[PDB]
Design a protein around this nucleic acid. Structure first.
Ligand SMILES: [Mg+2]
Ligand SMILES: [Mg+2]
Length: 739
RNA sequence: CUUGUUGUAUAUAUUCUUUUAUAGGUAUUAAACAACGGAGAUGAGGUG
């Protein structure tokens, strides 16, 4: 259906930076008003004032005084239930007849409806509507006890809904069922959910009104929708503009009518819209009405929107592959075995094993691990532990990161000289991804250090001498984000992340094209989500070590907080400085501990930065035009089931219910499953079987209706975790775990 | 108009940057292969 193209202007064009600046100022004032009145103002007062001023009884004005929306907050004009155009007209005429946007014409005297009613106000309404319909609040996990106020209980009651989607009584009951039926885990967490159920269904509607009220309050604090100073775009609706191909050129001409005057904007051609292609015909035959103007690095751009027909193919089920996405060791392990059958595939773990400068520093365990990986089809030999040796000068794993990097870069030069460009781009983007992640870490932790300096220089100290009422205001009135220094770091981070995204797309394109050019009609990923990531446990901070753990006053001989804290004291993580009482009053972060926290952060930050949960979206996008199709498998039990015999190990408690075992009851310390296989090779094989096997393909893979943009050919079922457990049990996917 | 954006050089000069240092900034210098539905500048941790 819809689709965009962007063009650049060549030379003469009346859309200067001042025009976009004026449009941006109008947008920002209007959206600032809407932000400041998202909830305080009532729709009823607006409609009554329109009754006072105009007096008409049109549909939108009548809907303002209807009993459904008479006293609801203004933000309901942006929800799903409220009629769209009625809200548009009501809000528009309210702002207009009060001159709250401050409109005083424009530079080029564009039509008032095309610049104000259908322009920046249209964008403001569209953007606020988009956000409020997908409100995403964020709350912390405060410890829940019997002694707590209703709000303290409720805040965590709303928290669990946010993190796990427990809107319904069914959603809670299917959740308690799951936890109690694996390993018989800690009773304390189950007690929490039981208490919340005693407090969730008690006040369901109140909780539902909350997490909307709170979500909006978390929207008027993050700035709402105020266009960021680096963007500088401008969207307009124009009625009779035409676009024609430039004469004797691979360009286009825009015939924009402005101020009743027929202008002419010269453009450059896009290779997207190159001559003779179907995309050029579709663009020129059916291009929309909305035009966007952007200033991107001191240059102007035009965005149009045309409509096309996608011809996405359908699932074939002849040659399938599962891709496990595990960031530890290789980024992309498949279900395939590296029998040198894939065309245009370079196995980098095999390349690292032929050389001896590498396998002379590797212990007997590491040799077996690397040689097990080298037998399978892997991709992007990211080594999170080795890569951290670049940042850690005193690392035990240094001289391994130097040899690894040198050998990889030497292979890159060899690939350049032998002219294998497909693999050359892959390896160069691998090297640059590894270096750019270190750059991202450097810049993002300079961001955090600078933020801490800013907090302790603006009086945002946790030790505060001001009212908490003022602190929240200033945290919003002058946050770190708006400061000039942060925009420098955020710009550098945007450049680095742009390189990261590009190199990641090059690697993903490489994998997809290898799978497509060999004949793999389906690629089965998993419905991975930010909950499927195992984050390394960061050490307790300075604040938490003394205050929560009550270490602020106790002797070294006195260890009552926890045993794990005592283990942290055993290693040189904290430097506990004794006071005159020989009990720890001042605490430190030791350089060993400082570099431990850095290792934890270095591993954890790979989730969002390297798109842990978006390595399926790019694969789907590559299938919108390719021949390989993408199948999403439920992100559970795939990395917990024996690949040789497809069964979930389960143990019989003496109570008498066959229940699954611990996630570590099946994994040893090494990345080897109890079936004697690499964990990722196990997980990848399981993924494929849930597609290869037709019965399992119908049980968990719910086929969408037809081919659609941005949609996999096969999707996971909507059944919850406990439903998936029982259905496998109902088909005898069961193995007794002989402990 | 060999035409737009992004990715991809471990390139020459560099009394530039440790806030991109196996990389960037400024001068250049060189190349094809790709993708492109506008895009993505929102939080770093502890006992669960
Ligand atoms: Mg770049
Ligand atoms: Mg280029």
């Amino acid at each position: 259906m819809k689709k965009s193209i962007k063009f650049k202007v060549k030379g003469n064009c009346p859309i200067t930076k001042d025009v976009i600046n004026e449009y941006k100022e109008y947008y920002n004032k209007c959206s600032d008003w809407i932000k400041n009145n998202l909830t305080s103002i009532t729709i009823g007062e607006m409609a009554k004032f329109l009754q006072e001023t105009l007096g008409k009884d049109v549909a939108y004005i009548s809907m303002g005084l209807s009993d459904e929306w008479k006293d609801k907050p203004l933000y309901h004009l942006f929800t799903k239930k409220y009629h769209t155009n009625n809200a548009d007209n009501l809000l528009y005429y309210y702002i207009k007849e009060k001159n709250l946007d401050g409109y005083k014409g424009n530079t080029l005297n564009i039509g008032n409806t095309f610049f104000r009613q259908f322009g920046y106000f249209k964008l403001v309404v569209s953007n606020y509507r988009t956000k409020i319909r997908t409100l995403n609040c964020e709350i912390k996990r405060k410890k829940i006890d019997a002694d707590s106020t209703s709000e303290d209980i409720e805040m965590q009651t709303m928290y669990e809904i946010i993190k796990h989607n427990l809107n319904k009584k069914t959603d809670w009951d299917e959740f308690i069922s799951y936890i109690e039926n694996v390993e018989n885990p800690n009773i304390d967490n189950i007690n929490r959910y039981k208490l919340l159920r005693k407090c969730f269904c008690e006040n369901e509607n109140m909780i539902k009104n909350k997490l909307e009220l709170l979500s909006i309050e978390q929207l008027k604090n993050f700035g709402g929708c105020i266009m960021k100073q680096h963007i500088n775009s401008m969207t307009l609706i124009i009625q009779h503009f035409k676009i024609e191909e430039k004469e004797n050129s691979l360009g286009f001409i825009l015939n924009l009518p402005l101020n009743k005057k027929q202008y002419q904007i010269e453009l450059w051609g896009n290779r997207q819209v190159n001559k003779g292609t179907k995309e050029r015909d579709a663009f020129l035959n059916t291009y929309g009405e909305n035009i966007v103007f952007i200033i991107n690095n001191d240059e102007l751009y035009v965005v149009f929107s045309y409509e096309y027909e996608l011809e996405k193919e359908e699932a074939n089920f002849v040659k399938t592959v599962g891709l496990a996405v595990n960031f530890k060791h290789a980024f992309f392990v498949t279900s395939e075995k590296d029998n040198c059958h894939l065309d245009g595939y370079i196995n980098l773990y095999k390349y690292l094993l032929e050389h001896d400068e590498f396998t002379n520093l590797l212990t007997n365990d590491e040799k077996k691990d690397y040689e097990e990986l080298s037998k399978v089809v892997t991709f992007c030999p990211f080594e999170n532990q080795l890569l951290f040796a670049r940042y850690n000068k005193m690392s035990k794993f240094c001289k391994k990161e130097q040899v690894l990097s040198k050998l990889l870069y030497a292979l890159q030069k060899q690939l350049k000289d032998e002219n294998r460009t497909k693999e050359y781009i892959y390896v160069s983007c691998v090297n640059k991804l590894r270096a750019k992640y270190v750059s991202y870490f450097i810049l993002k932790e300079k961001y955090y250090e600078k933020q801490k300096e800013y907090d302790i220089e603006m009086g945002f100290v946790d030790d505060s001498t001001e009212s908490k009422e003022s602190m929240d205001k200033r945290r919003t009135e002058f946050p770190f984000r708006n400061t000039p220094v942060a925009n420098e770091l955020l710009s550098k981070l945007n450049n680095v992340q742009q390189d990261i995204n590009g190199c990641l797309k090059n690697i993903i394109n490489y994998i997809y094209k290898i799978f497509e050019q060999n004949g793999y009609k389906i690629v089965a990923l998993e419905n991975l989500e930010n909950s499927n990531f195992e984050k390394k446990q960061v050490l307790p901070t300075i604040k938490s070590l003394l205050k929560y753990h009550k270490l602020e006053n106790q002797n070294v001989n006195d260890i009552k907080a926890s045993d794990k804290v005592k283990e942290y004291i055993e290693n040189g993580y904290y430097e506990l400085i004794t006071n005159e009482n020989n009990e720890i009053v001042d605490a430190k972060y030791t350089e060993k501990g400082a570099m431990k926290v850095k290792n934890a952060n270095f591993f954890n930050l790979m989730m969002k930065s390297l798109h842990f949960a978006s390595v399926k979206d790019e694969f789907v996008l590559l299938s919108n035009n390719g021949k390989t199709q993408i199948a999403l498998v439920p992100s559970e039990f795939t990395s917990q089931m024996d690949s040789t015999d497809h069964c979930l190990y389960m143990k019989k408690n003496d109570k008498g219910k066959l229940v699954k075992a611990d996630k570590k009851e099946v994994r040893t310390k090494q990345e080897k499953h109890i079936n004697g296989l690499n964990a990722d090779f196990n997980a990848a094989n399981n993924i494929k079987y849930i597609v290869e096997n037709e019965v399992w393909r119908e049980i968990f893979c719910t086929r969408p209706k037809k081919a659609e943009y941005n949609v996999p050919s096969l999707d996971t079922t909507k059944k919850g975790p406990s439903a998936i457990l029982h259905m496998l049990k109902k088909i005898e996917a069961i193995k007794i775990l002989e402990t």
